[PDB]
Amino acid sequence: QVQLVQSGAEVKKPGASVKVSCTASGYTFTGYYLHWVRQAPGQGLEWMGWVNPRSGGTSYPPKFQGRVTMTRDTSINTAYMDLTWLTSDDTAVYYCAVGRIPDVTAFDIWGQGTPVTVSSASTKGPSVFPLAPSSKSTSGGTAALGCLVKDYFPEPVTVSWNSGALTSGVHTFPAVLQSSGLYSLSSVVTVPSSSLGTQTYICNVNHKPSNTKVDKRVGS
Amino acid sequence: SPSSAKSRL
Amino acid sequence: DIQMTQSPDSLAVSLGERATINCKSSESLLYDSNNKNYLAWYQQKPGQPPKLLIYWASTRESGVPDRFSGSGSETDFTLTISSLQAEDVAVYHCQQYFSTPWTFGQGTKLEIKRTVAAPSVFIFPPSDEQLKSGTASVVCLLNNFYPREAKVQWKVDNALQSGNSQESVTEQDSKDSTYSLSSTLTLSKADYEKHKVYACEVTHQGLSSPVTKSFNR
């Protein structure tokens, strides 16, 4: 049952700090170094340092010396990584990782990951706009329609179709960061065109950080 | 020569 | 200190066929006093942490099937999947542990190669609801195509646009190995009711000439 269970996602503003925990089980926490590794979008894995769960000692590479503090708490088998002076380059998924193989500093145990967003933007709910099955049936004898979820912060947003009933054909695109600091995405679905008069298509948009719950009906 | 390993204490 | 460079960045291989990923170290991971190469490989499937795949260059971590193989020496290494399965689609990373700081490569994405399929193209004019906000979004949809490489051009009144559009690609679908792309053109409203015709023009390898979709108003 060996596993490392990390804390939930974090959103922060430049200058602030962030602290992520990692809880070990299924092995001797005080037997192995506990490392931290991050992954920024289009960057590649990056080692941040380790903490000795027995002595409480640490070691950080130059890049993170002065910004990172690693600590443990053996009473509850839990490690902590703390990062200060956050910038946009600190946006990444933060992993705790353990290596158990002698003389091999490579990690066979990883936490599920903790995404950390760093931005000056503030919590904003999205506007939901229909992408109605356009003026003419001819979309192939099949039809395409969707919902445009625009100008929200932060990630994630949740889009389903008819309360989760319609999943086949639906493509929920990855959000894209606009120049306003706000994310935006579209969700589309391919449908039989005969049923545009028969079926009612509703998309269920859910943005928890702002408690936005919108159901947009998409009619021709 | 390699840096000392950091896998088991 | 030690940089790690993988090649290629992206790789498409047919089911059943052979996948080869290289990794170059800037220094040399071979220790002459034990004849060991200090190099590891990882497999990272979407939305999950890395999984240790191979260490000491060619030793398979416990649980790794036989079709995964590591080879090479000193500064030049290679991960090989001999008979590519569907569950092997992922990002593969090489990591050196000769020197600290322990450094990784940039990753190599491995995806299923299939027969070329041109996209179905769809176009959506802005909703009216979006009329009042003062912003107009025109969305072009490229549906179920392979490979991922495509080019979407926008033309309002046959004027090519540049700077007012963004793109979003899905990950390769698990039932048909296709991709889907959305291209959104963003105009203030103080510009959408001026030009009759809006068009996205799609370039793809499965099309010997562009496909165009348009509407008026």
Q: Name the 3-class secondary structure at A209.
A: helix
**Residue C126: is the preceding peptide bond cis (ω within 30°)?**
no
Q: Is the dihedral of CA A192, A197, A198, A204 positive or negative?
A: positive
Q: Which of C149, C176, C175, C207 is nearest to C9 (CA)?
A: C149
Own/partner pairs, C207-213, CB within 8 angstroms, 24+ separation: C207/C118, C210/C153, C211/C118, C211/C119, C211/C121, C213/C121, C213/C122, C213/C123, C213/C140
Q: Which of C5, C12, C2, C20 is nearest to C76 (CA)?
A: C5
Q: How far is CA C136 from CA A80, C133, C184, C195, C214, in A?
A: 46, 8, 10, 13, 16
Mutate to test the interface with A, among B1, B3, B9 (most CBs of A within 10 A): B9
Report the top-level CATH class of C114-217.
Answer: mainly beta
**Identity of the residue in A45, A62, A144 whose CB atom sits nearest the CB atom of C50:** A45
**Residue C16 to chain B, least CA–CA distance (Å):** 36
* Gap between the Cα atoms of C105 and C89, Å rounded: 18
Resolution value in angstroms: 2.6
| Interface touch C137/A129, C-beta < 8 Å | yes
* Gap between the Cα atoms of C176 and C162, Å rounded: 33
| Interface touch A47/C105, C-beta < 8 Å | no
Domain C1-113 homologous superfamily, CATH = Immunoglobulins (2.60.40.10)
Within chain C, all domains assigned CATH 2.60.40.10 are found at 1-113, 114-217
| Interface touch B2/C33, C-beta < 8 Å | no
**Residue B8 to chain C, least CA–CA distance (Å):** 14
Experimental method: X-ray
Residues in A closer than 8 angstroms to C184, CB to CB, are: 148, 184, 186
Mutate to test the interface with A, among C141, C174, C187, C215 (most CBs of A within 10 A): C141
| Interface touch C98/B6, C-beta < 8 Å | no
Residues in C closer than 8 angstroms to B8, CB to CB, are: none
**DSSP letter string over C7-38?**
E-SEEEEETTS-EEEEEEESS--EETTTTEE-
* Gap between the Cα atoms of A160 and A170, Å rounded: 9
Report the number of secondary-structure helices (H) and strands (E) in chain A. Answer: 0, 19
Domains and CATH numbers, chain A: 1-120 (no CATH), 121-220 (2.60.40.10)
Query: Does A174 touch chain C if contact means CB atoms closer than 8 Å?
Result: yes
